Amino acid sequence: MGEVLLQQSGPELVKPGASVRITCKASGYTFTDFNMDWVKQSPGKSLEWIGDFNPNSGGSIYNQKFKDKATFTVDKSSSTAYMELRSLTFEDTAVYYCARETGTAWFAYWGQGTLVTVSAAGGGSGGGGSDIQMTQSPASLSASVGETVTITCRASGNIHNFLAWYQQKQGKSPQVLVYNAKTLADGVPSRFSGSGSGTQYSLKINSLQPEDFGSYYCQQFWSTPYTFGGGTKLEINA
Amino acid sequence: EFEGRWRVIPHDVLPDWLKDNDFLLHGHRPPMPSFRACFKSIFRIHTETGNIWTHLLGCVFFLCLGIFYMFRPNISFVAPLQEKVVFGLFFLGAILCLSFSWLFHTVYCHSEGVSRLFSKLDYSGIALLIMGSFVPWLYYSFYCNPQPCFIYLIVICVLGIAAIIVSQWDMFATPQYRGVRAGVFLGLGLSGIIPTLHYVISEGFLKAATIGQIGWLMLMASLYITGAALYAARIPERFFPGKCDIWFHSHQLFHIFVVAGAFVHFHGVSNLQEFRFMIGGGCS
Ligand SMILES: CCCCCCCC/C=C\CCCCCCCC(=O)OC[C@@H](O)CO
Ligand SMILES: CCCCCCCC/C=C\CCCCCCCC(=O)O
Ligand SMILES: [Zn+2]
């Protein structure tokens, strides 16, 4: 097709203990050619990697957080990917995304986001943290338009330059800026510059513009489970 | 392992620097800026698997061949120091050529910079193979004719060095210049006719043909031309795009020709050494 588009199902309002089956409709490419990932973002919180699914092999790799909560299925025929969330609790009120991998697990394409709201208005457990810890500095900043800003990402272990930078506008899916630590993605302005080696990486935005506000995230795709950085809220005074 | 997990990717989604052959549609390695991922990929199935192993196995073979040649009894040679240094420069060229190539194909997807730096070593690698192959052959052919032996060695050095300077050029690596590369390296090896004609003019038809100069040289030139034609014309993936992505594409076939061609050349030049042993040193 003309463009790669990931399109998910509409918002869900569910009774606690229900089950939801989220849809991702992939078009614009050979569905089986790339892995599809599932990403959860709780309100006012960072992205979490649910897991990945291989549409060709049919093989799924899950983050142990969601080992019991999520299940990945496919439909190679209709070119759709699914994710079933079961025994839903109030914690599960989050926006769930499908993000398409390319060769390595950096996400060039994202689904619009499905909102699962768990409500008992009509009449469980916690979340941990494992392996590679991604630390983002600063947690928030504000700069006048035309200024230069530098954001850092510090990995607990060596990630071997398998780092990607994302920008998220309000109530929208994140969009990739930099992949492989230095490589600039298509259509991304030259202002964004990714630099770094080993466990310490940085993103520099030069001559920041009014469109630059949003949330910035860094992802490590060297080891599994893939992890995201806490994020940096960027506010533009101008 | 769960570290540096990758998947084969279609041609279309490859960055511009990694897009070399439009005929290899699938099975590509995604750009991974980790030498860890690169060296493990040697044990994975992709577009460069055949390429890596052909020159990785050929490299150890020429090394063991180089090692064994040096340890040959000094009794078997008329001038063991001279012949060993002349054959040595050939193995130095063969081992370097092959080591550079399998290393380049391994680290091909690391970065634009790593590709640029290693591609330059790959091309320069072949120019060292042509320069090195000439040294023993030119030596035995002009054994009792020292002035042309010396002159022809300089022309191969200057031409070979020129080929090394031409390989440094960034436009040289572009897929459009594939033809230029094929011609440049073909010209270098095909420069063998100047010393051959001089040799034929002096030694004689019967004398040059008695010794398998011609039998061996037609074959050399055949591999040289049949070998470059495959590289430049991208046969057989020109027809059959897809299905040739993993096995028997032109680069892979060409890689086989380098190893095959270098062995056959060694065999021809090892015979010249054996003949000189029967004849003994000096001239009438
Ligand atoms: C006669 C020819 C002899 C050639 C010998 C060559 C030997 C090379 C073999 C194996 C090397 C294994 C690679 C292991 C080294 C990986 C380096 C690394 O950490 O890469 C990631 C960085 O880019 C970022 O931190
Ligand atoms: C002494 C061994 C000769 C064996 C024959 C080899 C084929 C002919 C030689 C050169 C012409 C093709 C060169 C291709 C240039 C591109 C570099 C590359 O191989 O990646
Ligand atoms: Zn090669």
What is each CA distance from A73 to A8, A55, A60, B142, in whole angstroms? Answer: 14, 9, 9, 73
Binding residues of B for Zn(2+): 105, 251, 255
Name the residue among A108, A216, A122, A117 with its Cα closest to residue A167. Answer: A216
Q: Can you tell me the distance from the alpha carbon of B189 to that of B197, in angstroms, rounded to the nearest whole number? A: 14
Rounded to the nearest angstrom, the minimum Cα separation between B125 and chain A is 29
A-chain residues within 8 Å CB-CB of B33?
A: 160-162, 180-182
B-chain residues within 8 Å CB-CB of A104?
A: 5-6, 30-32
Resolution in A: 3.0
Joined tokens for residue B53: 């192993």
Is some CB atom of chain B closer than 8 A to the CB atom of A25? no
Q: Dihedral through CA B99, CA B105, CA B110, CA B114, nearest 10?
A: 50
Q: At what angle do helices B112-141 and B178-189 cross, to 10 degrees?
A: 20
Q: Can you tell me the distance from the alpha carbon of A62 to that of A69, in angstroms, rounded to the nearest whole number? A: 10
Q: Is B73 exposed, middle or buried (0-12, 13-18, 19+ CB in 10 A)?
A: exposed
DSSP B200-231: HHHH-HHHHHHTTHHHHHHHHHHHHHHHHHHH
Is some CB atom of chain B closer than 8 A to the CB atom of A104? yes
**Which of B62, B97, B219, B254 has the most ligand 2 atoms within 8 A of CB, as the residue to mutate?**
B254
* Residue B80, preceding peptide bond in cis (omega within 30° of 0): no
Q: Can you tell me the distance from the alpha carbon of B163 to that of A228, in angstroms, rounded to the nearest whole number? A: 48
Range of the domain at B189: 1-284
Per-domain boundaries in chain A: 1-122, 123-229
How was this entry determined? X-ray
Name the residue of chain A whose CA is nearest to B35's CA.
Answer: A160
Block residue for tokens 């409709």: A25
Q: For residue B66, how many other CB atoms are within 10 A of its CB?
A: 18
- The yes/no answer on whether domain A123-229 falls in CATH 2.60.120.10 is no
What is each CA distance from A151 to A76, A82, A146, A183, A215, in whole angstroms? Answer: 40, 34, 16, 16, 11
Contact: B33, A182; criterion CB under 8 Å = yes
Name the residue of chain B whose CA is nearest to A4's CA.
Answer: B13
Contact: B33, A180; criterion CB under 8 Å = yes
Task: With H, G, I as helix, E, B as strand and everything else as coil, classify residue B28.
Answer: strand
Q: Can you tell me the distance from the alpha carbon of A99 to that of A109, in angstroms, rounded to the nearest whole number? A: 6
Which residue out of A4, A36, A131, A222 would a mutagenesis test of the B interface target, given it has the greatest number of B Cβ atoms within 10 Å? A222
**Which of B103, B169, B224 has the most ligand 2 atoms within 8 A of CB, as the residue to mutate?**
B224
Q: At what angle do helices B193-203 and B112-141 cross, to 10 degrees?
A: 0
Q: Dihedral through CA A171, CA A177, CA A180, CA A186, nearest 10?
A: 120
Q: Can you tell me the distance from the alpha carbon of A99 to that of A111, in angstroms, rounded to the nearest whole number? A: 6
Specify the number of domains making up chain B.
1
DSSP chain A: --S-EEEEPPPEEE-TT--EEEEEEEESS-GGGS-EEEEEE-TTS-EEEEEEE-TTT--EEE-TTSTTTEEEEEETTTTEEEEEE-S--GGG-EEEEEEE--SSS--SEE---EEEEE--TT--------SS-EEEE-SEEEE-TT--EEEEEEESS--TT-EEEEEE-TTS--EEEEETTTEEPTT--TTEEEEEETTEEEEEE-S--GGG-EEEEEEE-SBSS-EE---EEEEE--
Q: Can you tell me the distance from the alpha carbon of A81 to that of A110, in angstroms, rounded to the nearest whole number? A: 13
Helices (H) and strands (E) in chain B, counts: 10, 0
Joined tokens for residue B81: 């120091």
B-chain residues within 8 Å CB-CB of A102?
A: 9, 13, 30
Is some CB atom of chain B closer than 8 A to the CB atom of A182? yes
The gap from C-alpha B215 to its chain's centroid, in whole angstroms, comes to: 21
Cβ neighbours for B211, distance < 8 A, ≥ 6 positions apart: B271, B272, B275
Selecting from B6, B28, B33 the residue whose C-beta is nearest the C-beta of A181 gives B33
Name the residue among B91, B86, B185 with its Cα closest to residue B141. Answer: B86
Backbone angles phi, psi at A119, to 5 degrees: -135, 140
Joined tokens for residue A225: 């489970």
Contact A152, A163 (CB under 8 A): no
Q: Relative to the CA of B255, which ligand 2 atom is closest?
A: 19
Q: Can you tell me the distance from the alpha carbon of B116 to that of B121, in angstroms, rounded to the nearest whole number? A: 9
